[PDB]
Coordinates of C-alpha atoms and ligand atoms in Angstrom, one line a residue:
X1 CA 95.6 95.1 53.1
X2 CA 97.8 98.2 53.0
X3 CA 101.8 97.5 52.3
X4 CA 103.7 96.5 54.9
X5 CA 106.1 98.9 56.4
X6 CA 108.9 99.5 54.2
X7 CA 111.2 97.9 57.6
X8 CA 110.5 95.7 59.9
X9 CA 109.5 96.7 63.0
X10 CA 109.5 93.0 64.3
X11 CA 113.2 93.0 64.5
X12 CA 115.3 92.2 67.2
X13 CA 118.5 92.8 66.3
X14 CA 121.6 90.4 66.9
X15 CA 120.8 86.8 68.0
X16 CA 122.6 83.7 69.6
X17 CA 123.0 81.0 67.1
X18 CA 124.4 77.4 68.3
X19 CA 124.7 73.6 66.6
X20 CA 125.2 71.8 69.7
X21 CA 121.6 70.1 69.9
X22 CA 119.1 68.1 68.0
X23 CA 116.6 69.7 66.1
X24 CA 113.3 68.1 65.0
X25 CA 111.8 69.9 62.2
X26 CA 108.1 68.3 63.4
X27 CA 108.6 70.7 66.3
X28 CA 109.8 73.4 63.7
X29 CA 107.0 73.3 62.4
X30 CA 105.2 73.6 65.2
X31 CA 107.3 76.6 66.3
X32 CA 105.9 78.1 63.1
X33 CA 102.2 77.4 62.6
X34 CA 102.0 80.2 60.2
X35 CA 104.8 78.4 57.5
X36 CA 102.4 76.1 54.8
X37 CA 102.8 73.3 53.3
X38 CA 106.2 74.1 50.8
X39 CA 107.8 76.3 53.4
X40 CA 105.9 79.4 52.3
X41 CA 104.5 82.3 54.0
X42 CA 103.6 85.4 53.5
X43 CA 102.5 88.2 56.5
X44 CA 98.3 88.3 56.9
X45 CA 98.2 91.8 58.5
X46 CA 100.3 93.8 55.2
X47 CA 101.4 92.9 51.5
X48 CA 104.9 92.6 51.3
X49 CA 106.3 93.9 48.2
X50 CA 109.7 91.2 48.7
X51 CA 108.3 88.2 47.1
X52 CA 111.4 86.2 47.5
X53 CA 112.7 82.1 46.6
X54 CA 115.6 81.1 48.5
X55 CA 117.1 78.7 46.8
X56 CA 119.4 76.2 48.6
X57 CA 122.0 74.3 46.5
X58 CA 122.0 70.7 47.9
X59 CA 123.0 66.6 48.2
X60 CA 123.6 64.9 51.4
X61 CA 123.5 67.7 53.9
X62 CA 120.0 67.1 56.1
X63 CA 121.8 67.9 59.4
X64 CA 122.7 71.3 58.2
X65 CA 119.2 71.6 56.9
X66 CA 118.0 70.9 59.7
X67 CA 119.7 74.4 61.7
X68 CA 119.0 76.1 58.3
X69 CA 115.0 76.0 58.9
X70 CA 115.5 75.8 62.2
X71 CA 117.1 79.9 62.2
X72 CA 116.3 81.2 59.1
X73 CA 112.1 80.5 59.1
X74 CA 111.6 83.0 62.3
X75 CA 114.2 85.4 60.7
X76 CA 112.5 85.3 57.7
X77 CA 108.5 86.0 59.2
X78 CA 109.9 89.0 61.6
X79 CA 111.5 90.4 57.9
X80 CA 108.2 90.2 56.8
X81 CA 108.5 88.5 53.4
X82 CA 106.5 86.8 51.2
X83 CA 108.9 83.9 50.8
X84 CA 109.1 80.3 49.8
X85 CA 112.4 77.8 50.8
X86 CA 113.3 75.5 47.6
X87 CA 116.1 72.9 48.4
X88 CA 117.6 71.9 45.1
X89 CA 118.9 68.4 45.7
X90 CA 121.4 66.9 43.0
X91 CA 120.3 63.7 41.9
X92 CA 122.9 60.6 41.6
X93 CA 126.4 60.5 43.1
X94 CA 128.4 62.4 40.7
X95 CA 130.3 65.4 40.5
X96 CA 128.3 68.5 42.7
X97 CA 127.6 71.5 40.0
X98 CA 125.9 74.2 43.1
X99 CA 125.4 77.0 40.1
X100 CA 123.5 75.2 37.7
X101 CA 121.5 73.9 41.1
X102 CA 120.7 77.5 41.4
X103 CA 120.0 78.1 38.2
X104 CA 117.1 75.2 38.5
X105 CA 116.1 76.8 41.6
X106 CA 115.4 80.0 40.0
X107 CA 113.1 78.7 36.9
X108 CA 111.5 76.3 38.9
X109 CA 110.3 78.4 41.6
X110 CA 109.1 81.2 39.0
X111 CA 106.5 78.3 38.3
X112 CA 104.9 78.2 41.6
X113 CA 104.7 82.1 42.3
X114 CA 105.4 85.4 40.5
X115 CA 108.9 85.5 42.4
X116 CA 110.9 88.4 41.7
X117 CA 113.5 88.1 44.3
X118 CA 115.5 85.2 44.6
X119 CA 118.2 84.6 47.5
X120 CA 120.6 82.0 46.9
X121 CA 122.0 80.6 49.9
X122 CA 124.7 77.7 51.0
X123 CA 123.1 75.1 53.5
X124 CA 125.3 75.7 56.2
X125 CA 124.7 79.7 56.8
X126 CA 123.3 81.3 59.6
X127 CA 122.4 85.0 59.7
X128 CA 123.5 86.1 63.3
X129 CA 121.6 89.7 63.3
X130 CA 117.8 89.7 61.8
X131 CA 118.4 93.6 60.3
X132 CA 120.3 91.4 57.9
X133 CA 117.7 91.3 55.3
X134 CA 116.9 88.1 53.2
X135 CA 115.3 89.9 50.2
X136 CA 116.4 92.3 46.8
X137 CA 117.8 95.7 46.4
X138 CA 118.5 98.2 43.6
X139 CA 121.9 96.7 43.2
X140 CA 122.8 92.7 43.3
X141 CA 123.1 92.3 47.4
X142 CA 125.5 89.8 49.2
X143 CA 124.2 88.8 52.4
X144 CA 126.7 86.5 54.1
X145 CA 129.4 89.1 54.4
X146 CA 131.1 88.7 57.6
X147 CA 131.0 84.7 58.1
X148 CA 133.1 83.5 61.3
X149 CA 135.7 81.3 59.3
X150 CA 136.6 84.3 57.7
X151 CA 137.2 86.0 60.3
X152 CA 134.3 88.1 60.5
X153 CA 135.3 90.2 57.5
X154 CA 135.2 89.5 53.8
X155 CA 137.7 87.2 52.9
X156 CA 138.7 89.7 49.6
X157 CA 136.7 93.0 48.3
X158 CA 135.4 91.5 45.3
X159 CA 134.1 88.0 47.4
X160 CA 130.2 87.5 46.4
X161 CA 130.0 83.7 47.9
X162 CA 127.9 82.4 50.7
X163 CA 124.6 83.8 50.5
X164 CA 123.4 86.6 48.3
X165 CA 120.5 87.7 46.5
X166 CA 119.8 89.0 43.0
X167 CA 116.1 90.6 41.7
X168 CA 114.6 88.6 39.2
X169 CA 115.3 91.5 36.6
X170 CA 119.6 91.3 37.9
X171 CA 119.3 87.6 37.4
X172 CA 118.3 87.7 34.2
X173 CA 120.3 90.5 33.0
X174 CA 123.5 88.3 33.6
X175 CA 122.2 85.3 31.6
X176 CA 122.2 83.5 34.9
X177 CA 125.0 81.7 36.9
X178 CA 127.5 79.5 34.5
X179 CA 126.4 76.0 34.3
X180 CA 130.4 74.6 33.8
X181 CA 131.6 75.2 37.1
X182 CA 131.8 71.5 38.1
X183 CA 133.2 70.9 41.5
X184 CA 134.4 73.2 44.2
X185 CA 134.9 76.7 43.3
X186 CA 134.7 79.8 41.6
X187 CA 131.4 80.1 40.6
X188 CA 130.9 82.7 42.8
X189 CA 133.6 84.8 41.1
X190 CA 132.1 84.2 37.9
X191 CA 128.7 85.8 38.7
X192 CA 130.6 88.6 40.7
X193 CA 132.5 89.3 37.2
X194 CA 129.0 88.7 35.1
X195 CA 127.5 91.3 37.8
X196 CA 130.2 94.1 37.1
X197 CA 129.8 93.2 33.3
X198 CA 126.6 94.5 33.2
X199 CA 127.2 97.8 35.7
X200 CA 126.1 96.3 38.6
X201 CA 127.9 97.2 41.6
X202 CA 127.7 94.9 45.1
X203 CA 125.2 96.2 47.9
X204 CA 126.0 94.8 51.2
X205 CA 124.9 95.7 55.0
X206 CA 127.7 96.6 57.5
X207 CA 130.2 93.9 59.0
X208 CA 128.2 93.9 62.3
X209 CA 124.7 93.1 61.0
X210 CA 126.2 90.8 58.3
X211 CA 128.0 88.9 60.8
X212 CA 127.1 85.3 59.4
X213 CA 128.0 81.9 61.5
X214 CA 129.6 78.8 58.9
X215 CA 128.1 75.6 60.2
X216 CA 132.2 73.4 60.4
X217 CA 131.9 70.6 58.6
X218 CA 134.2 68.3 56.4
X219 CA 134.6 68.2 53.2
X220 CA 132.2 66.4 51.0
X221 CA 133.1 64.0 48.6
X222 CA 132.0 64.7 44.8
X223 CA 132.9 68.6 45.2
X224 CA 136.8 68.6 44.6
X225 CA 138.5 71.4 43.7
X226 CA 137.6 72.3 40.1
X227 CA 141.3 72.8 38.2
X228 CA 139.5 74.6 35.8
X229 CA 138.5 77.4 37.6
X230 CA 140.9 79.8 37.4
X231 CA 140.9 80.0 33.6
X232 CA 137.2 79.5 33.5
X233 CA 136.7 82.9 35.5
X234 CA 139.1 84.8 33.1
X235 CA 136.6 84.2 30.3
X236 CA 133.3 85.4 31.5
X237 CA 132.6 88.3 29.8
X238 CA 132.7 86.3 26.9
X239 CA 131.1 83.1 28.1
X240 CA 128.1 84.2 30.2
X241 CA 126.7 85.6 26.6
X242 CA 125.9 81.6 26.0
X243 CA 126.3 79.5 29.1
X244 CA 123.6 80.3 31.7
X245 CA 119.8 80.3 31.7
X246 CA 119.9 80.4 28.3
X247 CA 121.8 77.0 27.8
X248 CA 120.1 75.8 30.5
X249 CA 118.3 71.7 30.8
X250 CA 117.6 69.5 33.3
X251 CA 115.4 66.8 34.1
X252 CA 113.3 67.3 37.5
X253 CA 112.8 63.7 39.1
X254 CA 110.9 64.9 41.6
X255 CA 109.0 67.5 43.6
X256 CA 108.3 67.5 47.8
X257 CA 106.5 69.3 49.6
X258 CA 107.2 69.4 53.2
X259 CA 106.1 71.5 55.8
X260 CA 108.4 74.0 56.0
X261 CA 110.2 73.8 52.4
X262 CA 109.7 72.4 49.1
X263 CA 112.8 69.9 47.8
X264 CA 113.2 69.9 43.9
X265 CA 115.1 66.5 43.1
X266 CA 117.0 66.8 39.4
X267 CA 119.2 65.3 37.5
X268 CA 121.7 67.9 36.5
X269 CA 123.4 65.3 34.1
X270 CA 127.7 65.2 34.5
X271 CA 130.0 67.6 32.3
X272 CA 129.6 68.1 28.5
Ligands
LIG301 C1 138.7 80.9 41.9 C2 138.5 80.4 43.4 O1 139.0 79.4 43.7 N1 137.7 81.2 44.1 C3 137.3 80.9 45.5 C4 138.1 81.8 46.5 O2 139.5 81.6 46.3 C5 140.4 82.6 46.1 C6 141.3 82.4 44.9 O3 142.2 83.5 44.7 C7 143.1 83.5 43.5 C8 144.4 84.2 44.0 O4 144.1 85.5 44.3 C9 145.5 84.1 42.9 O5 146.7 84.8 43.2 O6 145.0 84.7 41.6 C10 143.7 84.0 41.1 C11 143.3 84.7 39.7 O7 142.2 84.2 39.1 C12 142.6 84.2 42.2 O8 141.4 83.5 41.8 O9 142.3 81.3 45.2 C13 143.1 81.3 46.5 C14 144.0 80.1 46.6 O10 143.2 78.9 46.3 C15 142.1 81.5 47.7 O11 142.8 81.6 49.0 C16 141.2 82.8 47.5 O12 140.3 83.0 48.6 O13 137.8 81.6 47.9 C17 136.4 81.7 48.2 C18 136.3 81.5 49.7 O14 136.6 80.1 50.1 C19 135.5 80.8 47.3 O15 134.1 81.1 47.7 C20 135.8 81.2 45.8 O16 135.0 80.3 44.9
UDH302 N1 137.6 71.7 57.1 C1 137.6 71.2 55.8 C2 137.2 72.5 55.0 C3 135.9 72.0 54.2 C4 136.1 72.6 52.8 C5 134.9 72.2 52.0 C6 134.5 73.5 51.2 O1 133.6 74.2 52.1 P1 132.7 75.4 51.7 O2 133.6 76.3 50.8 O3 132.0 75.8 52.9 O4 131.7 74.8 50.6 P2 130.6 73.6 50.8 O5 129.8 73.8 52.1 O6 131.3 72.3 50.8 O7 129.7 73.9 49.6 C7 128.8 75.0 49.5 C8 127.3 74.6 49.4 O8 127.0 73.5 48.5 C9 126.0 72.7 49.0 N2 126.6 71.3 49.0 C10 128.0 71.0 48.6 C11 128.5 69.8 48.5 C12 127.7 68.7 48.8 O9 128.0 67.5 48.8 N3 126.3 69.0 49.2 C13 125.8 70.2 49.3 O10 124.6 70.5 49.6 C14 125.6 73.3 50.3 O11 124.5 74.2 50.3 C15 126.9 73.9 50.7 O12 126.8 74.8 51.8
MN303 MN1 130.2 75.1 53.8

């Protein structure tokens, strides 16, 4: 098979993206006869050379699952990808750690498939234009750069939250995401800082094509405001030398594979 083009010429551009309706992921997966069993796919006609995980951080947040498949699995065939969805769902009912979920996601996946792009996005984000693309470039890429309830604009310059993507190589070169961010906030701060600490720089599409919708929702309980935060993304420089990947443990409980993504259940243990 030769490559596949190096863009998309399935694209169609911007797209109208509601939550006012039931979805029912048996007819998703209908919708999409060519997703297998795990949520992968891959295009039969070219080789794409974006092998990408997405990696979803999440506990108690079906519904919004739901509209994620529902959007992002045609968006993500037309981009041509060889992709695979992983929802990381935190065991138990204590305090939500969404970083060191992603940091799961990313050494789990690497053992299904030679990954070597990995997007990390929240549950409740909805690309609104399909030239937004899904997958890695030279620099670390955020994706979800003009979200609705911000807007339509970043909320600050240096904001790297939402949805993003990093190449396996990127990843690794920042030890990671920080495995102590416990609770609501700036994580995402902390891997902007441990991305400019290694001379990365931010890619990111225009504001029209990264127009991103924010599913509203409440807040969740478990996911207060970490008081730490602040002061823990002061330090990173120092601390993402030894709190990351490599300071990384877990224990997987357990491993589903539906239709149209696979959902890695773990026990992420409580603050240490
Ligand atoms: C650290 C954090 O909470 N980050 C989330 C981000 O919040 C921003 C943060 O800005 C702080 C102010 O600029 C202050 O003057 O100085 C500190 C220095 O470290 C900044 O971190 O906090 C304010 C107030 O809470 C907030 O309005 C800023 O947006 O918001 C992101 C979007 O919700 C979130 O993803 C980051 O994790
Ligand atoms: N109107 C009240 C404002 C609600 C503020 C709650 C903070 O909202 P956001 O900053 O969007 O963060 P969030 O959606 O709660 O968390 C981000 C991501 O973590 C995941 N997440 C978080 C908490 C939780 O219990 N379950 C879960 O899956 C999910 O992928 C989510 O999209
Ligand atoms: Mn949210």
């Amino acid at each position: 098979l030769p490559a596949c083009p190096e863009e998309s010429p399935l694209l169609v551009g911007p797209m109208l993206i509601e939550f006012n309706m039931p979805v029912d992921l048996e007819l998703v997966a209908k919708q999409n006869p060519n997703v297998k069993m795990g949520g992968r796919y891959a295009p039969r006609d070219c080789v794409s050379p974006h092998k990408v995980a997405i990696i979803i951080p999440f506990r108690n947040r079906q519904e919004h699952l739901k509209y994620w498949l529902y959007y992002l699995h045609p968006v993500l065939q037309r981009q041509q990808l060889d992709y695979g969805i992983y929802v990381i769902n935190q065991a138990g009912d204590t305090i939500f750690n969404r970083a060191k979920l992603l940091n799961v996601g990313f050494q789990e996946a690497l053992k299904d498939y030679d990954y070597t792009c990995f997007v990390f996005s929240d549950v409740d984000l909805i690309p609104m234009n399909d030239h937004n693309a899904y997958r890695c470039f030279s620099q670390p890429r955020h994706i979800s750069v003009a979200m609705d309830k911000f807007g339509f604009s970043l909320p600050y310059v240096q904001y790297f939250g939402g949805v993003s993507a990093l190449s396996k190589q990127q990843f690794l070169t920042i030890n990671g995401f920080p495995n102590n961010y416990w609770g609501w906030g700036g994580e995402d701060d902390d891997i902007f800082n441990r991305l400019v600490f290694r001379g990365m720089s931010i890619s990111r599409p225009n504001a029209v094509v990264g127009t991103t919708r924010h599913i509203r929702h409440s807040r969740d309980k478990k996911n207060e405001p970490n008081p730490q935060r602040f002061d823990r993304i002061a330090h990173t420089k120092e601390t993402m030398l030894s709190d990351g990947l490599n300071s990384l443990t877990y224990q997987v409980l357990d491993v589903q594979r539906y239709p149209l993504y696979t959902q890695i259940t773990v026990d992420i243990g409580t603050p240490s």
